[PDB]
Amino acid sequence: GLSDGEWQLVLNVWGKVEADIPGHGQEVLIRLFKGHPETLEKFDRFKHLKSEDEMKASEDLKKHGATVLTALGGILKKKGHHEAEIKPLAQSHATKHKIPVKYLEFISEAIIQVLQSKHPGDFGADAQGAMNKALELFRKDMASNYKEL
């Protein structure tokens, strides 16, 4: 897992994200949808958004971006003991939204990229290493919960 020092790096960086959740969330979704168009197909909600420029202008996309990062923040703040937060998310994402684990890898990469872009000093090698481990743990535990369902 992660050391307390590593968790501390993660949560300090996350505090910077919390300053502008909608801005960060919108950019994560844009990178996801543009980088991997197959992911946009899982969202009937955003079916009319056909370009990066349209995505950037959509208040609704920004709103959902905020929802995603708020939920992720809740999980991160529980450090290594996050089963209660992961369970319902695994349930909805497996059974209703039908989200493969690969797509969780894609959104993890998008998150890292956005953090690099918005926080070039603060999000250095050590912070990036720790955040990568934290997102890997999230993915592994989502995947494990998928199997229990």
Ligand code: HEM
């Ligand atoms: C960081 C990882 C993610 C988090 C924290 C997250 C969080 C959430 C939350 C809290 C909701 C609303 C409640 C629910 O239905 O579960 C939601 C809905 C949804 N999620 Fe995710 N999600 C993540 C990744 C993904 C990915 C990668 C996809 C698809 C590629 C996806 C597809 C969807 C869809 C289609 C909905 C319903 C949206 C709507 O029609 O309003 N999720 N997600």
